[PDB]
Amino acid sequence: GAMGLPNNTASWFTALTQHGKEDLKFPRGQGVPINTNSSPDDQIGYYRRATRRIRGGDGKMKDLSPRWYFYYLGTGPEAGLPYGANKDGIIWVATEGALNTPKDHIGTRNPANNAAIVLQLPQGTTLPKGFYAEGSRGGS
C-alpha cells in the first residue's frame, strides 16, 4: 500500500510544556484557551503531546521538553479521531457552546509564514502545577 502522509496541520496557538511526572488532564469544561481566532462553537478540540529531538549521526540530540499542542476537533484530513477517542498524548477539551463535529477550517496555516499566539487561559482558569506558559512568564 501507499505510505507517507504530507500532513502539516499547524496550531494557531503555542503548546504546553510539562515539567513533572504526570502528562496532562483537564477537567470537563476546561482546557480551552482564549481562542480569539475561532468562534464559540469552535471552542472544542484536543491536546497533542509532541517532542522535537534532532536525530544526529554522532548522537547529538537537541532534546526538548514534551509539549502539548492545541488542536481543534477534526484537525487532519485522515486523522480518524472522533470526540472521545483515547490516544497516547491526546486529551479532549470542550466547553459550553461547543458542538460535536469536525472543524478543520481552523486547522490550517502556514507555519513558515504565520506565527502562533501564546496559549493563555481565561479568567477563573489556571494552568496545572507542573506546566508553564510558552513565551510568557508570571511577572517577567
Partner RNA sequence: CACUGAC
Partner RNA sequence: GUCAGUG
**Where is the binding site for RNA, in residues?**
52, 67, 109
Q: Which is nearer to RNA, 26 or 68 (CB)?
A: 68
CB of 100 to RNA, least distance (A): 27
CB of 96 to RNA, least distance (A): 28
Q: Which is nearer to RNA, 67 or 103 (CB)?
A: 67
Cell representation of residue 75: 484537525
Alpha-carbon span 30 to 22, nearest angstrom: 18
Q: Which is nearer to RNA, 57 or 124 (CB)?
A: 57
Binding residues: 52, 67, 109
77 Cβ contact partners less than 8 Å away, ≥ 6 residues apart: 7, 104
CB of 1 to RNA, least distance (A): 25
Bridge partner residues of 47 (DSSP) = 70, 91
Alpha-carbon span 96 to 61, nearest angstrom: 42
b/e sequence 9-27, b meaning 16+ C-beta within 10 Å: bbbbbbbbebeeeeebebe
CB of 94 to RNA, least distance (A): 23
Return residues touching RNA (CB under 7 A). Answer: 10-11, 14-15, 17, 50, 52, 54, 56, 58, 60-65, 69, 111-113, 115-116, 134-135
